[PDB]
Amino acid sequence: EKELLEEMKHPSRARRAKARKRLEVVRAFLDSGNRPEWMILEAVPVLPPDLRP
Amino acid sequence: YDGRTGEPIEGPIVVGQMFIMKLYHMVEDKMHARSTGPYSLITQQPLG
Amino acid sequence: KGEDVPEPSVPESFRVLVKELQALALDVQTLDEKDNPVDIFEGLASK
DNA sequence: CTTGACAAAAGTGTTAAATTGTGCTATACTGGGAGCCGTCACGGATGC
DNA sequence: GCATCCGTGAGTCGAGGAAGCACAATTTAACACTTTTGTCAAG
């Protein structure tokens, strides 16, 4: 987040647009309390059998 | 003439013989009601 | 019995929604006024 | 409040069939196969 | 900045519903014997 904020001061609009999009995802993970590695599954949940009868 | 009063209709009426068909859509096959009945497996909502 | 129908409860389709969302590894939780979890499964799914 | 007698009825121990799971075949074989096809619109996405 | 591609979206009810084989390991069907109710007289 600190590097993205520093790059947010770049004069180029495309650089600021790219940094903002990355920072928005970073801010979402920081505020929510989720961990980025949770996006990779180590255990797959299995639906209850009555919902897949 | 009007069969209820016996008086004529105030204007002459186009009367003739026309060929009319009874179509396959009948209210006997379409009327349906339901208070309770079968329910779906997963959603448990009524069937259709 | 000649009585007025009772107050309804949570639909079973919403329960199907939660479990199908959980099968996608998404933690969907129903909260109360104080942000505390509320069990809509009547204790039947808690270990 | 019982007290013995009996008669099924469920429980237990062997016992064999019947079913189910697994290993094994020795001439030489060495890169798949159906896709084939009449919309049009938007937003977005790196790419350049 | 600009084609090009990828993705997503496009009304509601109804009514239609191609090996075999041997051998081992495991489960299951039958009995045979107890142990336990269930049901009687006796009170």
Swiss-Prot record, chain A:
DNA-dependent RNA polymerase catalyzes the transcription of DNA into RNA using the four ribonucleoside triphosphates as substrates. Belongs to the RNA polymerase beta' chain family. The RNAP catalytic core consists of 2 alpha, 1 beta, 1 beta' and 1 omega subunit. When a sigma factor is associated with the core the holoenzyme is formed, which can initiate transcription. This is DNA-directed RNA polymerase subunit beta'. It comes from Thermus thermophilus (strain ATCC 27634 / DSM 579 / HB8). The lineage of its organism: Bacteria, Thermotogati, Deinococcota, Deinococci, Thermales. The chain holds residues 474 to 526 of 1524 of the full protein.
Curated annotation (Swiss-Prot), chain B:
The RNAP catalytic core consists of 2 alpha, 1 beta, 1 beta' and 1 omega subunit. When a sigma factor is associated with the core the holoenzyme is formed, which can initiate transcription. Belongs to the RNA polymerase beta chain family. DNA-dependent RNA polymerase catalyzes the transcription of DNA into RNA using the four ribonucleoside triphosphates as substrates. This is DNA-directed RNA polymerase subunit beta. It comes from Thermus thermophilus (strain ATCC 27634 / DSM 579 / HB8). The lineage of its organism: Bacteria, Thermotogati, Deinococcota, Deinococci, Thermales.
